[PDB]
Amino acid sequence: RPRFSFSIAAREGKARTGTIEMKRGVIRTPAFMPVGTAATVKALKPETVRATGADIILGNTYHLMLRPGAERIAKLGGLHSFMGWDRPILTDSGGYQVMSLSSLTKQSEEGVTFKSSRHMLSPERSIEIQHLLGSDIVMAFDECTPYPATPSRAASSMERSMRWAKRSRDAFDSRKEQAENAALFGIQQGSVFENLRQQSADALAEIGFDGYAVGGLAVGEGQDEMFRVLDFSVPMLPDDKPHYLMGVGKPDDIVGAVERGIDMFDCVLPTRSGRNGQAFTWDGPINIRNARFSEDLKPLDSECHCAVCQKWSRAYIHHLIRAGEILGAMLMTEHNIAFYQQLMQKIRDSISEGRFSQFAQDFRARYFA
Amino acid sequence: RPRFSFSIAAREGKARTGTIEMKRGVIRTPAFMPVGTAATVKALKPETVRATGADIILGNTYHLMLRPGAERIAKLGGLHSFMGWDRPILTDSGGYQVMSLSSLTKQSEEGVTFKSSRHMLSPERSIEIQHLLGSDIVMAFDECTPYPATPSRAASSMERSMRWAKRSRDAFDSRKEQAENAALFGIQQGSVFENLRQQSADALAEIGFDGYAVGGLAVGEGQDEMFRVLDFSVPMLPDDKPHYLMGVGKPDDIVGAVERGIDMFDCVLPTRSGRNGQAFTWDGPINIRNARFSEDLKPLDSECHCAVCQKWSRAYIHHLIRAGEILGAMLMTEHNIAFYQQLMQKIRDSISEGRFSQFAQDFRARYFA
Numbered sequence: 182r183p184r185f186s187f188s189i190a191a192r193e194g195k196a197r198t199g200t201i202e203m204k205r206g207v208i209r210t211p212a213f214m215p216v217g218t219a220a221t222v223k224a225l226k227p228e229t230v231r232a233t234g235a236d237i238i239l240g241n242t243y244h245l246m247l248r249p250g251a252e253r254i255a256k257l258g259g260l261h262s263f264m265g266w267d268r269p270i271l272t273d274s275g276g277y278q279v280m281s282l283s284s285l286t287k288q289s290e291e292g293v294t295f296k297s298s299r300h301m302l303s304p305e306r307s308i309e310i311q312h313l314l315g316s317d318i319v320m321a322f323d324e325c326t327p328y329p330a331t332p333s334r335a336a337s338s339m340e341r342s343m344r345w346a347k348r349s350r351d352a353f354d355s356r357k358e359q360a361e362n363a364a365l366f367g368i369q370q371g372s373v374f375e376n377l378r379q380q381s382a383d384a385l386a387e388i389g390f391d392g393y394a395v396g397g398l399a400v401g402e403g404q405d406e407m408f409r410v411l412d413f414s415v416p417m418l419p420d421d422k423p424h425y426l427m428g429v430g431k432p433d434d435i436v437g438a439v440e441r442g443i444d445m446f447d448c449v450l451p452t453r454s455g456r457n458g459q460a461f462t463w464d465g466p467i468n469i470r471n472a473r474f475s476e477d478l479k480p481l482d483s484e485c486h487c488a489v490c491q492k493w494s495r496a497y498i499h500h501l502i503r504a505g506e507i508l509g510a511m512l513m514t515e516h517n518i519a520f521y522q523q524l525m526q527k528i529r530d531s532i533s534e535g536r537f538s539q540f541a542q543d544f545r546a547r548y549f550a
Numbered sequence: 551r552p553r554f555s556f557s558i559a560a561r562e563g564k565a566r567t568g569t570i571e572m573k574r575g576v577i578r579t580p581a582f583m584p585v586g587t588a589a590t591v592k593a594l595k596p597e598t599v600r601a602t603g604a605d606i607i608l609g610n611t612y613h614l615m616l617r618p619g620a621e622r623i624a625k626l627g628g629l630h631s632f633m634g635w636d637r638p639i640l641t642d643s644g645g646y647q648v649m650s651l652s653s654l655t656k657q658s659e660e661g662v663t664f665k666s667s668r669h670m671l672s673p674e675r676s677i678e679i680q681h682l683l684g685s686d687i688v689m690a691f692d693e694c695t696p697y698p699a700t701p702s703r704a705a706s707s708m709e710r711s712m713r714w715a716k717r718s719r720d721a722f723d724s725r726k727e728q729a730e731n732a733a734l735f736g737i738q739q740g741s742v743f744e745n746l747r748q749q750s751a752d753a754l755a756e757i758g759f760d761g762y763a764v765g766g767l768a769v770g771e772g773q774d775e776m777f778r779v780l781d782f783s784v785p786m787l788p789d790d791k792p793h794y795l796m797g798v799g800k801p802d803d804i805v806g807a808v809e810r811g812i813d814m815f816d817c818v819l820p821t822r823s824g825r826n827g828q829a830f831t832w833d834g835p836i837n838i839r840n841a842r843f844s845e846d847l848k849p850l851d852s853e854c855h856c857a858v859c860q861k862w863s864r865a866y867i868h869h870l871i872r873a874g875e876i877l878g879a880m881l882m883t884e885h886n887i888a889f890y891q892q893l894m895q896k897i898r899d900s901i902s903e904g905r906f907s908q909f910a911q912d913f914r915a916r917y918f919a
């Protein structure tokens with residue numbers, strides 16, 4: 182098995198489908214990564230995550246460095262062994278979460294100091310933490326520019342991120358075992374500004390990465406604006422490497438992003454909203470807590486192939502979620518993650534068959550009916 | 551498959567091992583029933599409950615009549631279909647839970663009126679609710695005498711329970727489909743008083759039941775007293791029918807109760823304490839939240855055959871429970887229920903082999919070391 186090999190099997194417009202081969206497994210693209218922030222995809226055993234179709238999951242440098250700790254996880258055998266997921270794991274670098282979740286932060290050229298306990302993150306420390314975790318796809322340490330931002334503020338922020346991208350590249354390359362067994366992705370910044378996105382793409386390509394994330398989106402800009410930025414931003418990235426849209430998103434966001442050349446996604450929506458009673462269906466989301474479901478014997482979704490829809494009724498799941506029962510969170514989450522994976526499968530198949538445009542149209546007409 | 555057939559395969563002293571054959575499955579005795587009060591064994595899919603070795607689970611008339619409702623469950627196809635457990639279910643009659651959980655209660659010869667919403671329970675209504683649920687083993691509607699009680703108060707209480715036992719018998723027998731497909735257990739009362747326990751046993755035997763529960767224990771009396779009462783109470787029950795000790799208990803309680811002739815048990819301890827961080831092991835319970843487990847790579851128990859102990863470390867489960875993660879509750883609960891089932895299996899095998907006395911001694915020496 183290779184360290185990292187991306188092959189594009191088919192295209193339709195800007196959309197691509199293919200595979201990333203890595204030592205711990207193959208990732209089918211476009212891919213959705215369930216989020217496992219605290220070394221667990223919430224309410225699911227890893228075997229269940231796999232059974233839904235997931236090829237890779239996401240972990241977080243920020244959360245794990247605090248609890249249970251990076252050195253501790255390494256001492257225990259690495260993140261894969263610790264949580265019982267033996268397939269690829271992508272870890273975010275901490276750059277977004279530190280600014281989102283920390284009470285106090287101090288930003289400088291060196292990195293970010295923060296209070297959880299006082300800690301520091303820098304390109305070097307982030308790469309080392311991800312090494313200790315045993316991440317298969319390592320993200321460069323970046324700065325997610327707040328939205329909105331003035332052109333000048335976006336520029337200075339993006340430029341720092343690019344300097345941090347080079348430092349990330351160097352730290353990764355200095356660690357032989359990491360460079361031989363893992364991959365490193367760069368993160369494009371530049372807010373909503375075309376010239377800055379271009380400068381960022383140029384800087385990242387000059388350094389060279391295994392894949393390229395579009396950072397700084399899904400930060401409150403809304404779908405229209407996100408799509409507008411993707412329209413010009415994705416073509417700036419190297420065509421022959423994967424394109425990863427961080428933190429996206431709703432099913433319609435995913436479809437539109439694939440139409441614009443994105444290959445990889447992660448989002449807490451299916452897990453979090455599952456726990457909250459929202460189930461995804463081909464006819465749009467439903468809230469299972471609604472009284473209309475109290476005696477509904479149909480499964481959550483009429484076409485869904487998941488184990489939950491094969492066995493339990495809306496009425497039962499309605500009862501569980503109303504009662505605050507853990508099994509309710511389990512079943513809703515398994516269904517939602519399975520729904521997301523089936524969406525990705527339909528996307529892959531339709532691109533492979535040259536009918537993705539029709540799929541996107543059919544999907545939207547029904548989902549938003 | 552027969553409606554209800556109890557066969558005793560082996561004995562040692564007062565202990566027995568055997569089988570109850572019912573239409574939905576065989577129950578190996580002595581048996582432990584996981585508790586599924588809200589139509590779910592908390593944090594476990596039914597397939598997982600079965601994988602641990604459970605032959606039968608317990609449901610509750612009181613909880614289900616309130617939420618989601620007995621007529622509703624019947625309309626949806628019955629409790630088995632609703633929750634996805636196709637094997638036997640025993641339902642308590644509501645007599646204990648109504649007095650334990652209701653804010654206001656009014657007791658009379660007719661039954662008990664209570665506030666959850668105002669509701670009523672009587673022998674007739676209880677049997678009908680259990681019919682609507684589709685219970686395989688139906689409990690008579692009784693009164694659990696508070697502890698301590700004066701001899702006279704215990705007597706009047708037990709006598710009412712016996713009148714209610716006859717009414718339960720008659721209501722059950724009047725419902726052809728229930729009488730043909732389910733079994734009915736009577737419940738012995740009489741507090742801690744030998745003469746009252748005898749009068750209760752005589753009354754129940756005169757009426758005739760498929761099995762006999764020892765009621766009115768595990769109500770704060772402590773193990774020494776519970777064992778003292780079991781010493782004289784169990785021999786009063788018909789030898790050729792199952793003996794069910796309601797609400798018991800800790801592993802040592804179960805072993806001692808089997809030594810005294812009990813065949814069936816139910817308790818929330820393995821599930822509830824699992825969620826709270828207590829794991830059962832052959833060397834006694836441990837609290838997985840304790841810092842001493844933070845880097846412990848051993849499984850919860852060194853001998854346990856469960857899926858949790860085959861895959862995950864104490865260190866990981868410690869992290870999950872500390873983090874408030876749902877997977878922590880899932881794994882702890884699966885292990886604890888599996889532990890209880892392995893205890894029952896060891897009990898059955900040792901009685902079968904005529905070495906139960908030695909097992910009880912060995913178990914206690916190690917568990918309490």
Ligand SMILES: Nc1nc2cc3nc(NCCc4ccccc4)[nH]c3cc2c(=O)[nH]1
Nearest residue numbers: 274276277325396397398399427428449450
């Ligand atoms: N390193 C790095 N990580 C990121 C994570 C993100 N996540 C998002 N969006 C998440 C939005 C969101 C929040 C709650 C529920 C659903 C979706 N945007 C993000 C941007 C970045 C980024 O620029 N750099």
Ligand SMILES: Nc1nc2cc3nc(NCCc4ccccc4)[nH]c3cc2c(=O)[nH]1
Nearest residue numbers: 643645646694765766767768796797818819
């Ligand atoms: N119908 C009926 N049901 C009962 C349920 C019981 N449950 C118990 N004990 C439970 C004690 C308990 C409580 C919390 C955690 C563990 C154990 N004693 C019980 C007695 C009766 C009884 O006499 N009649």
Ligand SMILES: [Cl-]
Nearest residue numbers: 223449452453
């Ligand atoms: Cl989540």
Ligand SMILES: [Cl-]
Nearest residue numbers: 592818821822
């Ligand atoms: Cl429980």
Ligand SMILES: [Zn+2]
Nearest residue numbers: 485487490516
């Ligand atoms: Zn489903």
Ligand SMILES: [Zn+2]
Nearest residue numbers: 854856859885
């Ligand atoms: Zn175990």
